[PDB]
């Protein structure tokens, strides 16, 4: 009985491995040794968003590629007019520990989350000329590592209870819960069509989930330590994972196995944040050694380094229009590179 | 610059001065982390926050494998409590204090130690119904290393054990770090009245260490 399921689970797992191998027709590197190399990209700091006094832990661009919300351990959420360095708002927070911050696509709300296991939603565009708390979502057991708005009434959160949840903001209730990860989910990314989302976890496994049904469609296991960052390719049919084992890897949803690994001999520190570019050829990863590396997504060769921070890069966001990259570190500065 | 951008800049400048004023008031307070075990009396010395002001200095202490340690890398000191009376789980407590001591981020972070259930410990070994050597026999020796204790002599040979259990938390302590961070053993009960002064005096010592290190007198 119990033993019978043990061999069945293993034997069915082997059929997974054999099915994965049959799809390994050729290496991604094998067919891509014909495109012109990107060369070396030289990115320079264009702004320094001074004003934060603690370690910046997250940032999020608005859909307009103009406003961005930044989160730091001083308990302040600041919206920046990055064009003019102006501070649009400054939201005090009830809890000073923020691990994630999100910008609503509409622009009327911001989400904050962290060690309080609560996703707080703030109304920006409202009367009285001040920002007020709209909802306080409660129900997770572990800390929120990420949260992403779907619309003005739905938000998907990732937590340290090995689960992800989908909320109805007006009701404040968990519409859907996502279970199956063994480790701590540390990152989250919504697909462009907001019907599926990936969630890399601490068990060296990444999973595709279905928002509508709530079932884990796929599971990817190629890493050896915590997966810290995860992000969809602009296609939506692949995602990249930056892990604490000092390696980026570009998993494929349909092929259901790893394509390309980004690792170098002299790099030993882990990976904190990962964000693609508009076209997906560039895979920018923020590292623990105070700078972020612009890996070539299809070539796995370092195309550059952004050494402008004197502490480790915590967040790494890229504009929706591709015009800028904003990096925040423990140095309490956001740098906008171009 | 526009009429509205000048007005917007004036708004940004006002936000700046409130940010600096709020940040300045946030500099006269000390972050304390609290860890330990379940049956340990964490609150007897999703995130709870307590703020006690000792000698006009604010100490805002916090209650919550541990991925979020990266948050607590600017903490003045991490308070750790281990179960002196609870015997057959101490080797778990050693392992927990081992990882906290050699963690990537808590390399310069000091630890205060607050051995708990001290009153229960005295009557635990007096009865004699608990062989520590069977838990772990380092006591086989029972050296009673020369020491001075304010407290009375042990009727059952209890006091050497009072410094016997304690010192395992000062051997892992002095194995890595090269003096960057310091552990401070202490013994406490649940009715030990003034116990916040111990953190205050220990936080006082740590500020010297960074102060002396910058001036390079240490």
């Amino acid at each position, epitope marked *: 009985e119990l033993d019978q399921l043990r061999q069945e689970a293993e034997q069915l797992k082997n059929q997974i491995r054999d099915a994965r191998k049959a799809c390994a027709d050729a290496t991604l590197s094998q067919i891509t040794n014909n495109i012109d190399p990107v060369g070396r990209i030289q990115m320079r700091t264009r702004r320094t968003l001074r004003g934060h006094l603690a370690k910046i832990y997250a940032m999020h661009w608005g859909t307009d590629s*103009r*406003l961005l919300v930044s989160a730091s351990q001083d308990g302040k959420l600041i919206i920046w*007019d990055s064009y003019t360095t*102006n501070k*649009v*708002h400054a939201i005090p927070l009830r809890s000073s520990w923020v691990m994630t911050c999100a910008y609503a696509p509409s622009g009327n709300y911001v989400a904050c989350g962290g060690l309080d296991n609560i996703c707080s939603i703030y109304n920006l565009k409202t*009367r*009285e*000329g*001040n920002v007020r708390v709209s909802r306080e979502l409660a129900g997770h057991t572990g800390y929120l590592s990420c949260c992403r708005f779907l619309d003005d009434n739905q938000i998907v959160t990732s937590s340290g209870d090995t689960t992800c949840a989908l909320w109805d903001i007006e009701t404040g209730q968990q519409t859907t819960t996502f279970t199956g990860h063994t480790g701590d989910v540390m990152s989250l990314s919504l697909a462009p069509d907001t019907r599926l989302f990936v969630s890399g976890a601490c068990d060296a496994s990444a999973k595709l989930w279905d928002v509508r049904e709530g079932m884990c469609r796929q599971t990817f296991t190629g890493h050896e330590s915590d997966i810290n960052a995860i992000c969809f390719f602009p296609n939506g049919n692949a995602f990249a994972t930056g892990s604490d084992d000092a390696t980026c890897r570009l998993f494929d949803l349909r092929a259901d196995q790893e394509l390309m690994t980004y690792s170098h001999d002299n790099i030993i520190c882990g990976i904190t944040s990962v964000s693609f570019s508009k076209s997906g050829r560039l895979l920018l990863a923020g590292y623990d050694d105070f700078n972020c590396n612009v890996w070539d997504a299809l070539k796995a060769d370092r195309a550059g380094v952004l050494a402008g921070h004197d502490n480790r890069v915590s967040c790494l966001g890229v504009t929706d229009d591709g015009m800028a990259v904003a990096t925040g570190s423990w140095d309490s500065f956001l740098k906008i590179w171009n | 610059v*526009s*009429a*509205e*951008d*000048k*007005a*917007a800049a*004036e*708004r940004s400048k*006002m936000i700046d001065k409130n940010l600096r004023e709020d940040g300045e008031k946030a500099r006269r307070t000390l972050r304390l982390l609290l860890l330990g075990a379940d049956n340990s009396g964490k609150s007897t010395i999703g995130i709870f926050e307590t703020k006690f002001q000792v000698d006009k200095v604010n100490f805002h202490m916090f209650d919550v494998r541990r991925k979020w340690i990266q948050c607590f890398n600017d903490v003045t000191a991490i308070i750790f409590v281990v179960d002196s009376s609870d015997y057959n789980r101490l080797q778990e407590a050693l392992n927990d204090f081992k990882s906290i001591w050699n963690n990537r981020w808590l390399r310069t972070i000091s630890v205060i130690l607050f051995l708990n259930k001290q009153d229960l410990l005295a009557e635990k070994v007096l009865a004699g119904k608990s062989k520590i050597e069977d838990y772990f026999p380092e006591f086989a020796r029972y050296t009673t290393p020369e020491d001075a204790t304010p407290e009375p002599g042990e009727d059952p040979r209890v006091t050497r054990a009072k410094y016997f259990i304690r010192k395992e938390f000062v051997d892992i302590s002095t194995a890595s770090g090269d003096g960057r961070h310091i552990c401070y053993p202490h013994f406490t009960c649940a009715v030990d009245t003034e116990n916040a002064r111990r953190i205050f005096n220990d936080c006082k010592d740590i500020i010297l260490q960074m102060n002396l290190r910058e001036y390079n007198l240490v």
Partner: single-chain antibody
Amino acid sequence: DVQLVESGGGLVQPGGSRKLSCSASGFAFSSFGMHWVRQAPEKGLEWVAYISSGSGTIYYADTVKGRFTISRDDPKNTLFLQMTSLRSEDTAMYYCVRSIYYYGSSPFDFWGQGTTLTVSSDIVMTQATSSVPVTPGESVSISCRSSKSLLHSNGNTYLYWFLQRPGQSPQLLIYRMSNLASGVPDRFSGSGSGTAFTLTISRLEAEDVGVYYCMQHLEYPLTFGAGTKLELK
């Protein structure tokens, strides 16, 4: 719940002094720039003074620069207009207006009531259509033309459209040509370019009769429109 109530005023002999007071209730008054605007008995809206948030920037109109004082008390949630050496040309009803200034804001959004006061270089607006009758249910378009290109290099155009209903305070319809305000029907719209701006009122309805004004914001002084009227028949 936003409410600006004006008081003071009345009958004053020439040469005297009078102080107006506006009390704010229902919003973060400390975070709003505030304006004083007069209304002559048979004329248009006219700027008087402006005080910034924090009282760090004050602008008075050249017409009353020197004998007018503007001040505010944020803890008291009130702002004052100290008038001295009142003139026979100062007979007007004074409104108090709130304006906030950041990226994406809508200044001049709320207007208060009016206080009557009876006493015994710059851009110029052109509201050429003094009064044009329009049948209900149709569409009417208003044209504005200033004497300067109202587009700044930051991409921000500058005209705020206002609607003054009979027996009511002016209200804000559009801020910066192509931006609807809060609580405004979608039929109102605005477009155009420098010195050539138009507002369209598609599907004219009841409770829409009033005099329309045109204000610039690229440089103080805050010169307003002469007034475009719409009436029934």
